[PDB]
Design a protein around this ligand. Sequence first.
Ligand SMILES: COc1cc(-c2cc(-c3cccc(O)c3)cnc2N)cc(OC)c1OC
Length: 296
Amino acid sequence: TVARDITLLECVGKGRYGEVWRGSWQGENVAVKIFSSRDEKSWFRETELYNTVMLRHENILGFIASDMTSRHSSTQLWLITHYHEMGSLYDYLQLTTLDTVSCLRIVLSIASGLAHLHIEIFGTQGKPAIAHRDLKSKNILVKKNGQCCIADLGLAVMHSQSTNQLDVGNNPRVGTKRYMAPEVLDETIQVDCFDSYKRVDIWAFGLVLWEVARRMVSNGIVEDYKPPFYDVVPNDPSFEDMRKVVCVDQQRPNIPNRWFSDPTLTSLAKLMKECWYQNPSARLTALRIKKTLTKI
Ligand SMILES: COc1cc(-c2cc(-c3cccc(O)c3)cnc2N)cc(OC)c1OC
């Protein structure tokens, strides 16, 4: 199997989930995620999705192999993907500003990726409908051509129309608190309905729009990279922190004055605002966001 053939070179990321490494396979960089024991369900889910569904798409992180292996005399669960050397959107936004073309490229490729996940495709070629549930700038990678791809199907949920069956998996993992929709933070989300999970994705994608737009230059100026809600919650905010700010105080990220004098940024501000209605039913769909971005 593929695990045995990889040389781990350096660690590019670490958290409670485990670790991601640059390794070489067949003379190429690959990304290897090594799961912690506390997160083996996310390995199982990603492996399930990539193996049982046809998931090749320019804007979805490309799967190579999933593997079990031994190291230091214990079992490690590995997920091997294409390696993107520009790193995550999160890192990238910190190291560079964007022009209009670069910004729209980033946001259109996210929306294309997400539309693709959300939409059930029929036949011998296709795929069930899929919601992500942990969309954020750290789970989006930047490719050399300026497009992005969506990463981490660990929390993914599926629906298929023949049977109308919802598969929510079996993962105790929760999404990133910073990016939880209101109906998640207030725990009134209807867990038996596929559409609810789509709407949590849209809420999160709104925030990512906001994060990107800040780094687009207009009138020679930019805002510094910041995470959503930077001004009102601490680092590593609690569930209650976010509940107070999003649900109780009803806060939403501020739109800089200067966006309103640029058309690309004005379109983006309206889009992201309609990802952020408290009432989930009111939010734009991925396909609507994609189509609009294709107009600009
Ligand atoms: C975010 O979730 C993941 C990301 C990557 C990944 C990361 C980098 C990278 C490199 C340098 C800096 C930096 O921030 C990221 C490049 N290519 C990649 N594919 C791989 C993953 O599974 C193997 C993964 O879990 C799904």
